[PDB]
Design a protein around this ligand. Structure first.
Ligand SMILES: [Zn+2]
Length: 108
């Protein structure tokens, strides 16, 4: 499983896709994920949520015409989701948050 900041960041910039252990929120819900029960690891063993579009409403991440942002969960194994996320753009800038999207720092 590749689910660390460095592992995922380097996989994205190389393969231009998330590794195989990621599924989107819609895919997890269809499989039986119920957020309030913390059951992802029971219904989709070895999977983490990732690949959804991140709005960037607050404008915290750098914006540019034609740039889209997406997110993925980092460090997840089981239980409720944590506060760690990787943020990646369509042009391969990579940011991290460990505080539920309040602050970001560049890592690639
Ligand atoms: Zn490619």
């Amino acid at each position: 499983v590749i689910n660390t900041f460095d592992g995922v960041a380097d996989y994205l910039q190389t393969y231009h896709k998330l590794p195989d252990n990621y599924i989107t929120k819609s895919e997890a819900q269809a499989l039986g994920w119920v957020a309030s029960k913390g059951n992802l690891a029971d219904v989709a063993p070895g999977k983490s949520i990732g690949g959804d579009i991140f709005s960037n409403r607050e404008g915290k991440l750098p914006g540019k015409s034609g740039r889209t942002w997406r997110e993925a969960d980092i460090n997840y194994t089981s239980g409720f989701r944590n506060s760690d996320r990787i943020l990646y753009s369509s042009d391969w800038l990579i940011y991290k948050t460990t505080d539920h999207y309040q602050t970001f720092t560049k890592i690639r």
